[PDB]
Amino acid sequence: DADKAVDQIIEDSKRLHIVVNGTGTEQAVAEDGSLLPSVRKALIDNLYFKTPPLPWRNGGSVNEFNQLYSFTDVSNTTWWYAPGATVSNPVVMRDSPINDGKFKVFLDKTNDIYAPLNSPNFVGNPRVPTPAPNSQSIPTTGWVQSEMEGLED
Amino acid sequence: IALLSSDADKAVDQIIEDSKRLHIVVNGTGQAVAEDGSLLPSVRKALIDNLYFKTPPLPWRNGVNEFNQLYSFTTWWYAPFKVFLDKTNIADIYAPLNSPNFVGNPRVPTPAPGDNSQSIPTTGWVQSEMEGLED
Amino acid sequence: DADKAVDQIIEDSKRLHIVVNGTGTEQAVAEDGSLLPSVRKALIDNLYFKTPPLPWRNGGSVNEFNQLYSFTDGNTTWWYAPGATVSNPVVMRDSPINGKFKVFLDKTNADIYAPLNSPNFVNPRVPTPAPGDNSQSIPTTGWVQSEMEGLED
Amino acid sequence: LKDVNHIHPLPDFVRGGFDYVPSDIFSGKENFEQTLRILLERLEFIDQKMVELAELRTTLNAEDAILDEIGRQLGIYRNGLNDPEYRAVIMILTGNNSKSGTRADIIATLKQLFGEDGVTTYKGYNYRLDINIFNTCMEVTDILPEIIDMLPLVTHLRVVENQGY
Amino acid sequence: ENYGLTGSGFNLPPMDDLVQETKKTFKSAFGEDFNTESNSVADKLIQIFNEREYQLWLLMGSVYYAQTMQGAEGIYLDDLLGKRGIYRLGKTRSTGTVDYELSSDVQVDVRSIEPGYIRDVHSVFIDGSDVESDNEYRIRAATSISEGKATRPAILAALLNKVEGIEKVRIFNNNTDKTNSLGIPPYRFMVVCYGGGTAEISQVLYDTIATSNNTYGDTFYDITTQVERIWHTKAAARQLAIRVRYRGRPLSLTEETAIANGLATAVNGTMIAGTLYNVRLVGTVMSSTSPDRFTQVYVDIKNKGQPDSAYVNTDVTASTTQVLSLELEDVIFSQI
Amino acid sequence: VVMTIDSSVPYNMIYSAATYTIDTDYELSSDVQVAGNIVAQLIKGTDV
């Protein structure tokens, strides 16, 4: 009757497999009917979901600690979040976060997509102005051929 | 027959401890220890120790004792001077490493003679290279 | 049958082990083509640190993946090394500008990435264009030789 | 209440010896402890391997690389046998030295190779004997030569193998 | 992990390595900037502890090697074969026929008084036998002993232990309905032996065969407890001769003795009605002496008295009632 | 001595003998060229 144990093992393996490899989000179902989150689902908490922040308001409240909000001053734009924001303790909204230390500003990480000045490793199709027919400037594919084009003769 | 399982436990237990660490990190309180002995703070703790700036900026005077208080001038500033909030984009001035379109006079360090690789040649390197075959 | 279920279990286990542990400068490989980041990534990946900056020191060795060290010359910049642990420390050399160290981002710092106009580089590389291209794309050192080769014969 | 076999890894070896620090004079200094721990923990590895040097040499768990040595002392050479059944033949031949080939006795030896219900034996009038197999876990042709040896000098034997009843 | 018993063998770490990781782990607890170079106080301390620890590995390796068959020497040899339930012999005494004394009372045999080695010639007896040395002790271990009965190994075991003067034995079985190729009547088995008595082996056989007298053979001898009889046969009946040809560096005189006597063991050990393989004979010569001494080798076999032209290199077998034997005045060495 | 080098260092680059010191009392024996002196290599993961 070890076939019975082998059975349960067989689909427990599959549940575990989907949980580990649950794409960005998968909801494995246990025998109790509860719902288990993929690893990448569990990783949303750090991921700090920067969708276009909900525009700043006066009134209303913030329920998610890691959600951002968009605010504009009389002059600049900033994104704000209240780490203390939680369910059963939402952060009441206010006129401006600059005196609402519940809220704090946030920045952007991605510089990543830009070539550093030191030994960058470009991809795709870089281009430059065809240099003078020289010395230190970067030549183009046509520039070289045009330079050599007169030489074959 | 299926008694290869004698190797499965060394993974099953290990994933048990890994799940335990996952749970403590995600659902911890204002830590976790990896097999390397280094610490992993739980989210509700990581939210505390990170860099927070003082939100009200101060007027500028070019006078200077804190790296965490902002100053205003006319733009926000701080002393690690370094500006904090200008109004200009970055993507408009800095070339992406993918499919850039440079303008003006780009320069690179001239490679060694005879290099046959993916490095970039210089106009004054190829032009030197031409004369060798000319002779 | 059942051996393949066990194989799934063991591969999932080693994947989960690497993901939970990771190295800060590391990302795991999922069964599908996607790659899974480690916790040491996700934390520093979005933004996280220990607030009180610490002075740089030539005789110091770092062992913590999330702390900022203030280098100075009074040009002060803050640095970190994701691949730093108690098990794998890293030595503060004379200057951080020389490996695992990375500088904290600022809207001034930028200031190390090549600007769109007339940038100076210090071993850049580009994909090799197809032979016979006359466009303004940038040729490689080999591409030049690959084309000069037809010339000689 | 206690195991007779005293060959076991010493329980909590590391914390012992540390118990011999006289009056906590050095405890909490984090400089002497590491030096002592680094040295003691080396003995941990050696202490652990002292067991396998004795545990693994038993015929039950001996791997093929050394099981041959055990068989060599007894004259049972590997020939073409593989590890899982090479263990079986070693047991069968050794057990034959205290046997008499009785009906009750024969059932006992076959019992170790096919579980509880995996084997049955019919008997015939004129020296005929039959062996039935239901749950074989190893290939039987290579084991067959021994199955003849532990039978009377004049047995007439048939062998039939099948899965299940 | 690569240290100790590993199935493929036993691995012993050298002195140098143990220091290397000990310093490495020791360095890990205090950083790179920690003097550990030669003659440093820290290094001196490390060496003392590792040397004391190293002996433990060496002791373990010696224990494992001491218990293997190849490394068995002296007393350690006695323990290993003792585990099998047999022990080396001691001072043995001579037996004669009508310094010495009578073995028992006589009326209308001979036993030596001295405890051992020993007045041993015709018309003025088993001499020697002081201590049973390891080489023959290993040989004597080749036998087997068991209390079983009615089974083929049991019959062989009992005969070699009880029947005096027995040297070889084999059994042929015909467990079918119709006479085999050897003419054995159906549902009967035959026992053939070399040496030994006739009215004693029957006694031994009676105590160990099943309660169904299935014996068959050339000669019979009745026994009683009810009366029945037991059958058996005797083979003897062959002596061989050998020649060897080789190319290379001549083998002096001592090696030929080492080669010659070694061959006599392999040929002699053959079973009753066995077969000799020319390849096996060659292998013995390559192993009874150090390799790298010959470029070619051949062996030729013929029966005693046959003409030299009768030498052959093909494999040879023996009839049912023949036993292969080899002696000296044989093994003609030669250089091609 | 041996040292690992980043993937990006070109083959033809040559180290100047008289512009380096290994440690407080060691220097290069002579000029060294990267090409022709590879002793070991490691390739992993990121490399169609």
Side-chain angles (χ1 to χ4, degrees), chain A, chain B, chain C, chain D residues 1-102 104-111 113-115 117-137 139-143 145 147-149 151-160 163-165, chain E residues 1-98 100 109-336, chain F:
Chain A
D1 275 15
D3 309 287
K4 266 62 71 178
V6 174
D7 293 333
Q8 179 170 359
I9 285 165
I10 281 164
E11 60 265 13
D12 293 0
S13 310
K14 299 175 197 173
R15 286 176 172 110
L16 188 153
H17 168 265
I18 67 171
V19 169
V20 161
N21 293 292
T23 81
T25 74
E26 291 294 324
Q27 194 72 77
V29 181
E31 295 293 329
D32 192 2
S34 77
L35 309 174
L36 309 175
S38 313
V39 169
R40 276 158 168 164
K41 297 173 75 182
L43 268 294
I44 63 171
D45 301 285
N46 304 269
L47 288 159
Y48 206 79
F49 42 90
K50 184 42 151 83
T51 64
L54 309 193
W56 181 271
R57 309 143 61 68
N58 203 356
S61 291
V62 177
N63 178 55
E64 301 301 19
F65 58 103
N66 60 344
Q67 179 165 55
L68 296 191
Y69 289 71
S70 173
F71 170 72
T72 303
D73 66 359
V74 296
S75 86
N76 306 315
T77 184
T78 53
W79 307 305
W80 304 83
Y81 68 116
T86 66
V87 175
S88 84
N89 174 59
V91 179
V92 182
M93 202 46 198
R94 205 201 80 141
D95 311 286
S96 174
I98 295 167
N99 304 329
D100 203 8
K102 296 308 305 305
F103 292 90
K104 304 188 178 170
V105 72
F106 189 68
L107 282 294
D108 271 297
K109 67 95 176 179
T110 304
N111 61 8
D112 294 332
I113 61 171
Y114 300 119
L117 281 160
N118 170 41
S119 302
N121 195 2
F122 297 104
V123 302
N125 280 284
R127 306 151 210 140
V128 300
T130 295
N134 56 54
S135 302
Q136 187 62 5
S137 304
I138 302 180
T140 61
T141 56
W143 184 95
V144 173
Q145 285 180 353
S146 55
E147 284 283 325
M148 200 76 68
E149 275 159 60
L151 188 153
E152 288 92 5
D153 304 330
Chain B
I1 52 186
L3 277 290
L4 163 65
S5 302
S6 297
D7 185 75
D9 286 272
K10 314 142 201 173
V12 171
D13 63 358
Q14 197 277 332
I15 62 170
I16 287 167
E17 293 83 4
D18 292 332
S19 66
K20 185 34 52 193
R21 290 154 200 155
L22 172 74
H23 159 73
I24 187 165
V25 164
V26 63
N27 218 350
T29 62
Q31 272 214 338
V33 178
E35 83 192 336
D36 291 331
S38 55
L39 293 169
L40 310 176
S42 70
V43 171
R44 294 195 176 103
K45 180 175 184 293
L47 286 168
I48 285 160
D49 63 358
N50 68 254
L51 279 76
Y52 292 125
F53 298 83
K54 282 89 171 187
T55 180
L58 310 185
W60 178 258
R61 300 181 179 171
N62 73 42
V64 74
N65 69 321
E66 277 208 319
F67 68 89
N68 200 241
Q69 173 52 57
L70 295 177
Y71 297 79
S72 184
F73 187 43
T74 300
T75 64
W76 287 4
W77 293 78
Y78 78 92
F81 274 83
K82 320 287 273 181
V83 66
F84 183 66
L85 291 182
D86 52 70
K87 293 181 181 179
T88 74
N89 191 357
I90 66 181
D92 298 331
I93 48 171
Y94 296 116
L97 76 165
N98 173 12
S99 311
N101 307 274
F102 297 92
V103 303
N105 193 319
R107 278 79 56 86
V108 302
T110 291
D115 167 43
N116 197 315
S117 83
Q118 286 152 321
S119 298
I120 303 176
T122 56
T123 47
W125 170 98
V126 180
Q127 187 270 332
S128 48
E129 291 291 328
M130 293 177 70
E131 295 152 42
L133 285 74
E134 178 72 359
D135 291 331
Chain C
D1 294 331
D3 55 335
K4 296 147 207 156
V6 173
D7 293 348
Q8 293 176 272
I9 276 178
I10 57 174
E11 52 205 279
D12 288 329
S13 304
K14 65 178 72 66
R15 289 165 199 155
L16 182 61
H17 171 53
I18 192 66
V19 159
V20 161
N21 285 272
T23 314
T25 300
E26 182 276 343
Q27 175 188 13
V29 165
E31 181 171 356
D32 56 357
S34 71
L35 302 183
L36 276 156
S38 59
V39 170
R40 285 177 174 131
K41 290 293 292 296
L43 291 168
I44 77 171
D45 191 2
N46 284 267
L47 192 43
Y48 281 113
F49 289 117
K50 267 175 283 293
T51 189
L54 305 188
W56 181 266
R57 204 179 90 270
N58 193 12
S61 290
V62 175
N63 64 7
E64 189 277 343
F65 84 113
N66 172 267
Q67 188 152 194
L68 304 179
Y69 288 95
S70 181
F71 173 84
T72 307
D73 61 9
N75 304 303
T76 292
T77 55
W78 303 335
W79 298 76
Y80 51 99
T85 65
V86 67
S87 60
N88 288 75
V90 180
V91 163
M92 293 180 183
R93 325 181 219 167
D94 50 349
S95 170
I97 302 159
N98 305 343
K100 284 63 61 183
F101 284 116
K102 324 173 52 62
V103 65
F104 183 86
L105 285 173
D106 300 289
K107 266 214 160 193
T108 62
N109 295 288
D111 188 6
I112 58 173
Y113 284 88
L116 284 155
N117 189 355
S118 308
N120 284 111
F121 294 100
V122 296
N123 180 22
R125 303 151 205 144
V126 306
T128 294
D133 173 36
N134 193 0
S135 304
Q136 297 209 119
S137 52
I138 303 170
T140 65
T141 56
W143 186 91
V144 168
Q145 297 186 33
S146 73
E147 201 155 79
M148 293 177 71
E149 181 36 70
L151 183 151
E152 70 89 24
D153 190 348
Chain D
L1 182 60
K2 294 162 32 53
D3 188 358
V4 70
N5 188 359
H6 291 278
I7 301 179
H8 282 82
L10 199 78
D12 193 348
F13 187 109
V14 171
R15 185 179 67 189
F18 265 86
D19 287 349
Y20 292 141
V21 182
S23 307
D24 282 358
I25 187 68
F26 284 0
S27 54
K29 186 175 215 80
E30 68 274 15
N31 212 318
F32 166 86
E33 293 83 3
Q34 303 312 328
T35 300
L36 179 63
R37 172 172 271 93
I38 288 160
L39 302 179
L40 287 170
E41 294 179 353
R42 299 201 61 69
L43 307 186
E44 294 293 328
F45 204 61
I46 301 164
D47 186 74
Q48 183 66 41
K49 309 293 281 273
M50 271 275 198
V51 184
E52 293 82 3
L53 172 44
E55 181 47 289
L56 302 178
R57 283 218 317 276
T58 193
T59 190
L60 281 293
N61 291 318
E63 182 65 26
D64 62 30
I66 59 176
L67 184 64
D68 63 358
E69 182 65 26
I70 302 177
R72 174 141 61 230
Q73 273 144 20
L74 303 165
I76 305 166
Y77 296 83
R78 181 81 64 81
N79 298 300
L81 278 293
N82 204 247
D83 183 317
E85 71 275 58
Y86 191 40
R87 189 164 276 120
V89 55
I90 293 283
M91 295 298 102
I92 295 161
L93 290 176
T94 47
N96 185 157
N97 225 325
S98 66
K99 306 311 270 282
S100 299
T102 62
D105 189 358
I106 290 160
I107 290 163
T109 175
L110 304 189
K111 194 53 71 143
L113 309 176
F114 308 121
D117 63 358
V119 55
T120 54
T121 51
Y122 182 76
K123 179 178 180 180
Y125 290 81
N126 62 306
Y127 294 150
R128 288 284 322 302
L129 181 138
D130 291 331
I131 298 176
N132 291 319
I133 298 160
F134 306 147
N135 189 359
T136 192
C137 69
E139 191 277 332
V140 300
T141 62
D142 63 358
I143 294 172
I147 308 312
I148 318 305
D149 213 318
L151 303 182
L153 184 61
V154 285
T155 183
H156 188 130
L157 177 65
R158 180 172 63 87
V159 55
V160 298
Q163 183 66 41
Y165 297 73
Chain E
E1 172 36 50
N2 317 135
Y3 311 106
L5 173 72
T6 178
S8 314
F10 191 97
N11 188 46
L12 189 82
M15 185 64 73
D16 43 8
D17 64 358
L18 305 177
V19 172
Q20 283 313 359
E21 69 275 16
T22 298
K23 285 161 82 152
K24 174 192 161 23
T25 184
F26 184 75
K27 194 173 321 313
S28 308
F30 306 109
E32 293 83 3
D33 177 358
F34 188 95
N35 192 282
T36 61
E37 71 87 9
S38 175
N39 297 115
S40 70
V41 63
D43 188 358
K44 176 190 102 163
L45 184 139
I46 296 302
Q47 299 262 269
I48 301 299
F49 283 106
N50 291 113
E51 151 175 4
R52 285 284 274 94
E53 190 277 331
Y54 172 77
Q55 303 314 70
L56 293 202
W57 292 105
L58 191 70
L59 188 149
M60 293 177 71
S62 73
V63 169
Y64 161 86
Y65 185 81
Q67 273 154 350
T68 185
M69 183 278 288
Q70 188 274 331
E73 190 277 331
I75 296 159
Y76 300 111
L77 183 63
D78 291 331
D79 183 332
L80 286 168
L81 297 187
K83 201 166 268 174
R84 284 291 320 310
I86 58 178
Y87 322 120
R88 57 167 166 75
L89 307 187
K91 299 298 293 295
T92 287
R93 274 151 201 71
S94 180
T95 59
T97 291
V98 296
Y100 292 166
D109 190 356
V110 165
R111 184 208 180 266
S112 73
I113 286 281
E114 287 156 352
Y117 187 93
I118 181 55
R119 206 159 178 175
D120 293 330
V121 180
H122 294 87
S123 51
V124 173
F125 52 97
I126 301 294
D127 293 332
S129 72
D130 56 10
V131 298
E132 192 275 332
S133 197
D134 65 336
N135 290 297
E136 65 274 23
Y137 181 68
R138 279 208 210 70
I139 286 162
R140 192 154 63 87
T143 62
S144 169
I145 61 178
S146 65
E147 193 161 31
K149 315 211 161 273
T151 184
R152 324 311 150 200
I155 308 307
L156 300 166
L159 292 168
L160 295 186
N161 284 258
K162 300 289 94 175
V163 182
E164 190 277 331
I166 194 76
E167 40 190 352
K168 291 182 176 279
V169 56
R170 188 172 182 197
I171 299 170
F172 293 79
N173 188 359
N174 179 0
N175 57 288
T176 62
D177 284 18
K178 187 269 183 181
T179 51
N180 63 1
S181 62
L182 298 175
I184 305 186
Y187 301 108
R188 284 184 158 60
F189 73 95
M190 181 165 48
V191 185
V192 57
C193 294
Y194 178 36
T198 190
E200 302 73 27
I201 173 160
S202 49
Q203 177 91 22
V204 172
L205 280 165
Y206 165 83
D207 297 272
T208 186
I209 57 168
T211 60
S212 291
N213 186 352
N214 296 265
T215 65
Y216 164 69
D218 184 74
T219 184
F220 71 92
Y221 177 82
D222 299 67
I223 196 161
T224 178
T225 178
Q226 312 302 340
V227 189
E228 61 85 20
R229 57 179 58 177
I230 301 299
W231 299 85
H232 67 282
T233 61
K234 308 198 172 198
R238 185 179 294 275
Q239 304 77 240
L240 291 177
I242 306 293
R243 175 184 66 204
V244 59
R245 290 175 289 100
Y246 65 97
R247 180 180 314 293
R249 179 66 178 86
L251 301 203
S252 168
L253 179 139
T254 59
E255 291 85 339
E256 293 82 3
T257 59
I259 302 299
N261 63 7
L263 293 171
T265 69
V267 58
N268 195 287
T270 55
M271 311 155 38
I272 310 190
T275 78
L276 281 167
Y277 306 80
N278 194 291
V279 300
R280 288 187 209 232
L281 303 181
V282 168
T284 61
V285 182
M286 301 315 78
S287 54
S288 65
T289 186
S290 179
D292 292 331
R293 184 51 161 290
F294 322 110
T295 77
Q296 286 78 240
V297 60
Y298 309 86
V299 298
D300 311 318
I301 308 97
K302 70 173 189 157
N303 311 268
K304 178 60 68 67
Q306 292 191 265
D308 61 307
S309 60
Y311 266 122
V312 297
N313 75 308
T314 180
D315 294 4
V316 182
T317 183
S319 75
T320 313
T321 62
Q322 281 165 17
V323 178
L324 306 183
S325 73
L326 182 143
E327 313 86 331
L328 277 72
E329 293 83 3
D330 190 44
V331 192
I332 302 301
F333 294 86
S334 54
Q335 296 208 127
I336 175 59
Chain F
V1 175
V2 309
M3 75 220 279
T4 305
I5 60 182
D6 160 52
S7 72
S8 84
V9 182
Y11 291 99
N12 59 301
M13 183 300 309
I14 293 186
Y15 285 105
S16 179
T19 71
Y20 293 86
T21 166
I22 287 78
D23 53 46
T24 56
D25 43 358
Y26 278 105
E27 71 286 16
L28 277 294
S29 296
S30 295
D31 183 72
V32 175
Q33 174 206 252
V34 166
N37 292 284
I38 295 93
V39 64
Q41 171 67 36
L42 178 57
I43 289 169
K44 173 178 64 56
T46 57
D47 315 71
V48 168

